């Protein structure tokens, strides 16, 4: 009976790093989590079917386009749970033109059946500051207000995921320099 | 079924207007939706049963089966949608005296399944102020701390709806004097 | 219809005394709702098994063991509600090292089928003093910010519950020295 952890965040919050750096310290101790990336789940199956041209042209497609390739990673990742403790790096909601789209709607929530959901946070100002220094990608650097509104809906969604699955919801805080503090807490929650 | 859109917001925030005005402009575009005030769609159930008269003793009505009424109206709109894209002017939660009442309960929610939920928001001060100008209704005059509260719990409903039904949650701001901007927001989300 | 009322408030807020007082008055005027305390109930399930020596340290167990016990207690009360209306005393979310474990997952909400979910609230300054002036316990005395984060997620928990069960979500304030505003406002919705 293995453990599925969901690590959610707004872009540029550092969900991924904190996760990766968390499993590495764990690997050496005994606990070999997976590093699935729920977004890339659907991008191994996307250029493969001609909907994007990279990993930043997927949330500029229509609602009916993404919501097919979702319920598929849903059990495809669930499969991987019949092998090892998973850590599904995903998004509580998704910023799109149509509005906040749930990153794990009920049908994906049953398929995955999480034991813990985690909402990595920080200020919009710090998030924004981080979005700029990351040469590795393109960030909206939108206003603080939109960050907070997102981070607000991310909580109400995270909590519903906990209601529906019984998953406990952890809120990790991740400050500049203090990223070590987010790992270790993601660790006490992972162990 | 088809494309179904639910448009919500506390009394006074002007969600009804934003909806009519959009579908006025939409009707001249050769695409045709459907105004439906969930409120009166369920008034037809009222007198046909003689349970209360007013459209007031229905959030103030005997709480057994306020839900009965609520239930039926929600699947009546159901078929109203296979036929045409629908737009449902309603509320996320209804501030009855037993607390907030979820406009779209689990059942009605499934019995409808919108592809979009829309949350219309503005300051308590302005909401309050529009209520003074709504002479069309026998309005109440509540505090702002409590308007803000209700808009809180609304967003939460609204997001629990999204998850349960894969629908996108859009928060559309509708400030004083700027009716048309929210109209443009509603619309480009309907397309 | 037999009436299941749920009442929640972070530890320290006064959910218990609120419901206590609310019933004396009700019991000395006809309806004694059954006074039932979710944690008292499930403690009795744990001590008997040895998993807990004190009621206090059950939330420091593992989530999954907490959910087990929790589920047994949810169905102990379910049979309690076949034969008398029950104001059940519980929590929107429990605070654990692994985050906010819900207080009524979907399967538990199904069990009780509450009609009203009530949230008791107040400032985290006021609560922190209630926690110090309470001999009957051994409180851990946490940060203000951590109380509002819990009281936040509580609201989204308790809102989730409304959308699933169709219960009404009543929010109720218990300030210092004003213990009897809560009692009376509870009854007013309790009867
Ligand atoms: N389940 C779902 N359903 C439907 N669609 C889904 C979905 N899940 C994903 N998608 C789709 O997938 C696409 C991809 O998502 P998108 O958000 O665009 O990229 P991502 O794969 O999800 O990664 P992030 O954007 O979240 O970057 P990150 O900050 O979280 O991680 P990291 O810390 O390593 O990023 C680098 C950051 O590290 C942080 N960092 C690095 N060094 C430091 C430091 N020294 N101090 C503090 N922070 C640091 C910085 O903030 C830096 O920016 C989206 O279009 C989305 O629509
Ligand atoms: N889901 C469901 N379940 C259970 N019950 C349900 C239900 N759905 C509905 N009901 C029931 O239906 C009943 C009421 O019907 P319903 O119409 O659904 O709710 P309501 O309380 O009566 O809503 P209002 O008409 O008062 O507010 P509004 O913002 O929609 O009105 P308007 O667009 O005119 O805006 C207000 C005024 O401000 C003006 N205004 C001024 N400036 C602006 C501007 N800047 N933008 C927009 N409007 C402006 C507008 O012109 C207008 O005059 C309730 O009892 C409720 O129980
Ligand atoms: N659904 C679920 N799922 C999984 N686990 C669950 C669960 N539900 C419960 N649990 C578990 O069960 C346990 C729950 O224990 P629980 O039953 O919840 O604790 P308790 O013994 O009742 O006391 P609390 O710590 O809960 O404080 P309270 O404020 O709620 O009650 P009170 O008003 O009397 O506090 C009284 C004190 O506050 C003060 N006070 C009250 N009102 C006022 C007033 N207005 N002015 C001044 N002081 C006041 C007085 O000083 C008094 O001393 C947890 O460990 C958890 O594991």
């Amino acid at each position: 009976k293995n453990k599925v952890v969901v690590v959610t965040g707004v872009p540029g919050v550092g969900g991924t790093t904190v996760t990766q750096k968390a499993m590495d310290i764990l690997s050496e101790e005994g606990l070999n989590y997976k590093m699935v990336n729920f977004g890339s789940a659907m991008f191994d199956v996307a250029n493969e079917e001609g909907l994007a041209s990279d990993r930043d042209q997927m949330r500029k497609l229509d609602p009916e386009t993404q919501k097919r390739i979702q319920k598929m990673a849903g059990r495809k990742i669930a499969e991987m749970a019949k092998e090892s403790p998973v850590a599904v790096d995903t998004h509580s909601t998704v910023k799109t033109p149509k509005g906040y789209l749930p990153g794990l709607p009920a049908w994906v929530l049953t398929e995955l059946n999480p034991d813990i959901v985690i909402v990595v946070e920080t200020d919009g100002d710090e998030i924004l500051m981080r979005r700029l220094s990351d040469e590795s990608r393109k960030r909206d650097l939108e206003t603080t207000a939109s960050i907070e509104e997102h981070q607000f809906m991310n909580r109400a969604a995270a909590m519903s995921y906990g209601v529906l699955t019984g998953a406990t919801v952890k809120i990790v805080k991740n400050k500049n320099g203090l990223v070590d503090n987010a790992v270790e807490e993601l660790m006490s929650v992972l162990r």
Side-chain angles (χ1 to χ4, degrees), chain A:
Chain A
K1 302 318 224 185
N2 274 342
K3 182 192 194 150
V4 192
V5 176
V6 170
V7 196
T8 55
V10 304
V13 86
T16 309
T17 65
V18 169
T19 302
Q20 260 285 315
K21 301 186 148 175
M23 293 167 311
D24 306 342
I25 319 191
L26 278 195
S27 292
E28 324 171 48
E29 100 147 50
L31 262 309
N32 302 349
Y33 278 95
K34 204 53 183 69
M35 338 166 261
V36 200
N37 191 322
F38 204 116
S40 295
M42 20 193 302
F43 174 90
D44 299 353
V45 217
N47 275 341
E48 191 256 353
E49 283 167 61
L51 290 179
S53 280
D54 35 21
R55 52 210 272 95
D56 300 303
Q57 279 187 323
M58 243 184 49
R59 47 178 275 272
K60 317 290 186 178
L61 308 162
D62 57 285
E64 207 192 333
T65 281
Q66 307 174 79
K67 288 195 270 295
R68 299 167 194 170
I69 349 296
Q70 259 199 338
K71 201 168 79 185
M72 279 153 68
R75 37 191 151 192
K76 270 270 174 74
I77 292 151
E79 279 144 18
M80 233 174 305
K82 298 170 311 160
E83 334 270 349
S84 74
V86 238
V88 192
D89 220 35
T90 182
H91 282 272
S92 174
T93 59
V94 180
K95 275 172 195 114
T96 79
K98 312 264 156 271
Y100 297 106
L101 168 77
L104 316 169
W107 49 83
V108 169
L109 276 185
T110 298
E111 304 186 306
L112 283 177
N113 192 37
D115 295 327
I116 304 176
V117 180
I118 291 179
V119 181
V120 191
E121 305 199 354
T122 198
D123 266 7
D125 315 37
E126 300 194 49
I127 287 178
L128 237 24
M129 205 130 32
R130 279 179 210 159
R131 282 188 198 180
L132 289 169
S133 58
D134 186 2
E135 290 146 28
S136 80
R137 295 176 67 175
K138 315 159 183 201
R139 259 73 179 249
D140 281 350
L141 96 158
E142 305 201 321
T143 58
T144 289
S146 62
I147 292 158
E148 300 316 327
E149 236 190 45
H150 196 200
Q151 274 183 354
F152 177 115
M153 306 288 289
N154 292 12
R155 288 186 156 200
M159 213 54 232
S160 294
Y161 298 152
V163 182
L164 298 166
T165 70
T168 66
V169 185
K170 180 51 153 178
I171 295 171
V172 171
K173 294 308 212 177
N174 181 38
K175 300 167 199 218
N176 297 332
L178 311 172
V179 167
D180 327 89
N181 314 27
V183 173
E184 266 281 37
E185 213 219 4
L186 197 133
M187 264 180 65
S188 58
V189 89
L190 275 208
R191 270 156 220 161

